[PDB]
Design a protein that fits this description.
The structure is a homodimer. Chain A is mainly α. The first copy, chain A, has one domain. In chain A, 66% of the residues lie in helices and 0% in strands. Chain A is built from twelve helices and no strands. In chain A, helix 3 packs antiparallel against helix 12, helix 4 runs antiparallel to helix 8 and helix 8 crosses helix 12. At the A-B interface, helix 5, helix 7 and helix 9 of A face helix 4, helix 6 and helix 10 of B.
């Protein structure tokens, strides 16, 4: 890739913190795949300029993706017409908090998802909370539809959360950033996507006529975070 | 035009015109302000968009589309709409209305902002939190795309997708449920089949809109400047794009039964009425374009 490689400090400490979060959520085996697949290292590559709290959050979400969440879709589309859809629906009920959340909200995966969402929303504005809750809903939905848009969009929503900044919503939906997010999610034929990325990235200065100083700095850190998702994912695949 | 679906119309347009006049009066949005029904016939357009609504829902749709034409669009009339840093400001401050902000700005408390507040509060009524989040997201997506359309931006398919994102239909279809008294479950709303049906509907509506209001990011002018076509050639090309999207819509529409294995009876009925509402959007928009 044409971008430098960066890695986060707390990969060890987050690895320690995660091992407690797994126990305090009833997820203690499947943790033998967390240390085998090197998910903490992937969290270190995805979010290098994140705070320690942010790296702990992203690591927890990564293990939530590989161990408990997929242990529900283990062998779906063979014995689950509406069971997988009620699991996804129940987790969305954990996101929204409905009067009757059901047994899915009291399960370790659902409790842990409630904790992850509770931590992800801290400090963020209602625009980020609404947009990220919508991206979570679409992820769970399209993940249900595959029993007859991957998880990269919520991670790209996590760049702002773990980075201690926020991109304004009016330029968040600008077609330049939308296309950059689509090309980024595709790379997670590839040289054409890299060239197209480096071409669309020039137009990032065309959205500075609607921004201020802090906003332009926010868009800078978001596009850099996409660089880090691509190069870091490439590294983690490379050393595995 | 010459679409495969029948033209259907809500019978209660006349009451909606009167309720809507009273609503305009109450919200401080109104002499020389009653040129919205006489010449632009927005009550009948509301009837074409939501012919299966309740009377209350039809009245809400009418209020929304009048809010679209007179107050909202007035802010961007003539040369006011070619200012990036101003259109961005109005759109952002209107977006504030849709969220609970402690100390809103002065545009949030302006007449257009308070009217938008009433439209949003009424829209949320009786809808689940899933619908509120999703439709609110679609609202801000519309406002941001309009902001993007305020600056000179430039394949044809990319421009059609952009014009579809920047048209209002992405909120309009969110109202099919609200005005009709049902709700599509969130786990199937985002199903690729329904997503593609919504995309095709929006693209067709934006092709009609640009085809009529092309008097630049407009599809017709974009085809003229970038494919070397003259006006009749660009118009015919737009008809070709509409036709191919009709065909695609009728193709993937048959796959709606793939979501039956995910739903109960009420859900399947909801999806059915939603697709019919898409039919009503395309056909009604074409008719209203023909007469108005």
């Amino acid at each position: 890739l044409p971008w430098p490689l960066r890695k986060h400090p707390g990969v060890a400490g987050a690895r320690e913190h995660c091992l407690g979060w797994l126990a305090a959520q009833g997820l203690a085996l499947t943790a033998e795949t967390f240390v085998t697949w090197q998910l903490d290292e992937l969290a270190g590559y995805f979010f290098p300029r994140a705070t320690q709290e942010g790296l702990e959050l992203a690591t927890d979400l990564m293990v939530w993706y590989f161990a408990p969440f997929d242990d529900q879709f283990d062998g779906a589309l063979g014995r689950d017409p509406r069971r997988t859809a009620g699991v996804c629906a129940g987790l969305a009920e954990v996101l929204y908090g409905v009067p009757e959340p059901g047994p899915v909200a009291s399960s370790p995966v659902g409790r842990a998802l409630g904790d992850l969402w509770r931590r992800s929303c801290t400090g963020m504005s209602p625009f980020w909370r609404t947009r990220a809750r919508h991206n979570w809903t679409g992820y769970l939905a399209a993940h249900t539809a595959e029993s007859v848009a991957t998880s990269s969009h919520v991670i790209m929503d996590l760049i702002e959360r773990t980075g201690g900044f926020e991109v304004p919503a009016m330029v968040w939906h600008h077609p330049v950033l939308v296309e950059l997010r689509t090309l980024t999610s595709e790379m997670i034929l590839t040289a054409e996507r890299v060239a197209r990325f480096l071409d669309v990235e020039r137009a990032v200065t065309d959205v500075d006529c609607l921004l201020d100083g802090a906003g332009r700095e926010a868009v800078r850190r978001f596009v850099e975070g996409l660089h880090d998702l691509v190069r870091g994912d490439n590294e983690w695949e490379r050393t595995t």
